[PDB]
């Protein structure tokens, strides 16, 4: 069971950005929603509790909704003190715990959006030959600084073995990020494809690769 | 008003045990349940469970078995996160806060000290063993670049310390070569890739090279990318 919230979130100062947080009956559905502030490097805040209701401090700009089994934060008045990563959670019947959402970043535009370019290489010849497979996903050219990769094997999602930069800026004043799928050789083999899957604000892009 | 303190930050090997203090200032401890959370460098929220603080009584989520245990000292106010036979993929900060109980509805009772953070506590877990990288080439592909164009590259695998300098044939290929900001694996070790795109009618006769240096192992590699 997983909260799926969007990579990144933007608008221009004072516009309003409103932040999915999409779930399952068994938590959205059958227990309350909580949104959290978290500047980086810093501790999260409590931002909304019971899907609705603020604590002391918190401006009413911000705002939280619960529709059946998704939720979503609406920050009006967007400025630049907003930016930040905010999580949605609540209580999952399946895991019995408390989830978390995988975060949404969201960015006052200095710059209209940009879409990411997406490169995915294979294992070289030369690894498989050392007895492991390494499959390269890189991610150029995109802004707001914020992408979800998820990689699939023969288009089911694979969670094992992955490692994932945050975004940087390259010369070109775009962010890119790179991922990382690692397998064995007999896996490599064995299935038909994998896929590198990027989100990022409208866009998906999803590259496959075959042996 | 809570405030939790938190144990400072923490540099371990792999195999070593670790104990995370999480301290209640200026408030009633048995008042609220501790929740702990971790997150890995760059990453998102991972709940780990909670401890009563009435009871003592702790509760795990799925992910967090055996080497992560909650433990409490009520004679000072302090609720303890310890992580046995530390593994390099426990690299991250933990948090502890208070927390809410499940609610029926919105009826009842609500403090706002129910969730309030911890600045966390950063725990390390790495040998710091110096490796020298793998470097493997990335034969190009023209799927990504432009008309008359293609991407080859280098993939520089599993070396410690940082850094790692890439250079294209010695110096001499500059022009649309980006080396990407190595990632730190749950393994503790980095990997980067540096990549370039050059025109597709050289591949039959421009040699492409890439020049791996890694000073921390004295290790220089020139590996030949060939389609
Ligand atoms: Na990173
Ligand atoms: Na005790
Ligand atoms: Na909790
Ligand atoms: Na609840």
């Known amino acids: 069971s997983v909260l799926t919230q969007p990579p990144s979130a933007s608008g221009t100062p004072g516009q309003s950005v409103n932040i999915s947080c999409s779930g399952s009956?068994?938590?959205?559905?059958?227990?309350?929603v909580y949104w959290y502030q978290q500047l980086p490097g810093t501790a999260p805040k409590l931002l909304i509790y019971?899907?609705?209701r603020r604590p002391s401090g918190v401006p009413d700009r911000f705002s939280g909704s619960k529709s059946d089994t998704s939720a979503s934060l609406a920050i009006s008045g967007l400025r630049s003190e907003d930016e930040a990563d905010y999580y949605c959670?609540?209580?999952?019947?399946?895991?019995?715990?408390?989830?978390f959402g995988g975060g949404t970043k969201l960015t006052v535009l200095g710059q209209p959006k940009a879409a990411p370019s997406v490169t995915l290489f294979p294992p070289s010849s030369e690894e498989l030959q050392a007895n492991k497979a390494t499959l390269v996903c890189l991610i150029s050219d995109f802004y707001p600084g914020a992408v979800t990769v998820a990689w699939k094997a023969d288009s089911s999602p694979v969670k094992a073995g992955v490692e994932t930069t945050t975004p940087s800026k390259q010369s070109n004043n775009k962010y890119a990020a790179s991922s990382y799928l690692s397998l064995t050789p007999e896996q490599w083999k064995s299935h038909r494809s994998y896929s590198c899957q990027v989100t990022h604000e409208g866009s998906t892009v999803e590259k496959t690769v075959a042996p | 008003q809570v405030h939790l303190v938190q144990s400072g930050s923490e540099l371990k090997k792999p195999g070593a045990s670790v104990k995370v203090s999480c301290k209640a200032s200026?408030?009633?401890?048995?008042?609220?349940?501790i929740k702990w959370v971790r997150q890995a460098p760059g990453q998102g929220l991972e709940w780990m469970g909670w401890?009563?603080?009435?009871?003592?009584?702790?509760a795990y989520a799925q992910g967090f078995t055996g080497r992560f245990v909650f433990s409490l000292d009520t004679s000072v106010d302090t609720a303890f996160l310890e992580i046995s036979s530390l593994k390099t993929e426990d690299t991250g900060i933990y948090y502890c806060?208070?927390?809410?109980?499940?609610?029926?509805?919105?009826?009842?009772?609500?403090?706002?000290?129910?969730?309030?953070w911890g600045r966390g506590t950063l725990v390390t877990v790495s040998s710091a063993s110096t490796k020298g990288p793998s470097v493997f080439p990335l034969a190009p592909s023209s799927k990504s670049t432009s008309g008359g164009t293609a991407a080859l590259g280098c993939l520089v695998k599993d070396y410690f310390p940082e850094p790692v300098t890439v250079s294209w044939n010695s110096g001499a290929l500059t022009s649309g070569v980006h080396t990407f900001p190595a990632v730190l694996q749950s393994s503790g070790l980095y990997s980067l890739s540096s990549v370039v795109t050059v025109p597709s009618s050289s591949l039959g006769t421009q040699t492409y090279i890439c020049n791996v240096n890694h000073k921390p192992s004295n290790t220089k590699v020139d590996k030949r990318v060939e389609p």
């Open positions: 806060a208070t927390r809410p109980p499940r609610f029926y509805d919105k009826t009842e009772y609500w403090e706002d000290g129910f969730d309030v």
């Open positions: 200026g408030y009633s401890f048995s008042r609220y349940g």
């Open positions: 401890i009563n603080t009435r009871s003592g009584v702790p």
């Open positions: 009956s068994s938590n959205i559905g059958n227990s309350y």
């Open positions: 019971r899907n609705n």
């Open positions: 959670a609540t209580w999952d019947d399946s895991l019995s715990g408390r989830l």
